[PDB]
Design an enzyme around this catalytic site. Structure first.
Site, PDB file in Angstrom:
ATOM      1  N   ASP A   8      30.488  41.205 -25.403  1.00 25.10           N
ATOM      2  CA  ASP A   8      31.611  41.229 -24.478  1.00 25.10           C
ATOM      3  C   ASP A   8      32.763  40.422 -25.068  1.00 25.10           C
ATOM      4  OD1 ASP A   8      29.504  42.305 -23.107  1.00 25.10           O
ATOM      5  OD2 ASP A   8      29.823  41.153 -21.264  1.00 25.10           O
ATOM      6  N   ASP A 130      26.789  51.154 -11.223  1.00 25.85           N
ATOM      7  CA  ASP A 130      26.188  49.928 -10.731  1.00 25.85           C
ATOM      8  C   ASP A 130      25.551  50.249  -9.389  1.00 25.85           C
ATOM      9  OD1 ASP A 130      27.171  48.568 -12.962  1.00 25.85           O
ATOM     10  OD2 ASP A 130      29.033  48.036 -11.934  1.00 25.85           O
TER      11      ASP A 130
END
Length: 229
Positions: A8, A130
């Site tokens: 990330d 998600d």
């Protein structure tokens, strides 16, 4: 099942967002390019990159770094980060990105997602969902399995499914797999040890691993070995 090491990025820096009650940011020392080559040299064949800077504001997407990463890395690079336009997706695949992760619009605009799918193909496009357990698994009001049913019949192949409560939610993936045997699931969230990898073996096509590799809990070599058939 293959391991997919992940980094990330915020402003060229390798970080990780720890989540729960408070979103907390830990900044690492590693140079993104060097870390990715190291994973590759260790045997990684797939790499995942999240552009958190771009995810926060699309005008400041890290194209230059992504481009460079894409052309020095000799294995498949997959990129995500609040990607919500065909132009975005096309710009990324032109840098040499293998697969682009979309998903923030999977329900607020199913037609654009379908369009992206048809234009660029099912091998180049990954759907990020998600999902949470209420009485049923829902997208974070709509049922996960029904959202999946919809895209599955339109040639969707790759999904990146995260339980945003998280070891890993093994039960969630075993049953996505039970019902949609042809979908290639990438698991993400809650990977804390080799045992999480072992429990997903045969179920998921890929396992996203970030923190565990960064904190040295296990190595890419160990991950690949325990997933080996």
């Amino acid at each position: 099942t293959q391991i997919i090491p992940a980094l990330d990025l915020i402003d060229g820096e390798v970080v990780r967002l720890v989540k729960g009650d408070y979103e907390q940011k830990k900044v690492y020392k590693y140079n993104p390019l060097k870390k990715f080559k190291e994973y590759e040299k260790a045997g990684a064949k797939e790499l995942h990159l999240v552009d958190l800077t771009g995810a926060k504001d699309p005008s400041k997407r890290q194209f230059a770094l992504i481009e460079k990463l894409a052309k020095e890395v000799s294995v498949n690079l997959q990129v995500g980060g609040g990607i919500r336009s065909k132009e975005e997706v096309k710009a990324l695949l032109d840098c040499g990105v293998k697969r682009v992760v979309i998903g923030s619009m999977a329900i607020k605009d199913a037609t654009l997602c379908l369009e992206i799918l048809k234009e660029f193909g099912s091998e180049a496009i990954v759907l990020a969902l998600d999902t949470i357990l209420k009485e049923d698994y829902v997208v974070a009001d709509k049922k996960l399995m029904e959202v999946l049913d919809f895209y599955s019949n339109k040639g969707l192949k790759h999904i990146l499914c995260t339980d945003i409560s998280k070891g890993v939610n093994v039960r969630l993936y075993k049953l996505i797999h039970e019902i949609f045997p042809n979908i290639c699931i990438q698991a993400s969230g809650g990977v804390a040890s080799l045992k999480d990898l072992e429990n997903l073996k045969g179920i998921c096509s890929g396992v996203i691993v970030g923190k565990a590799l960064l904190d040295g809990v296990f190595s890419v070599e160990e991950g690949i070995r325990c997933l080996a058939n």
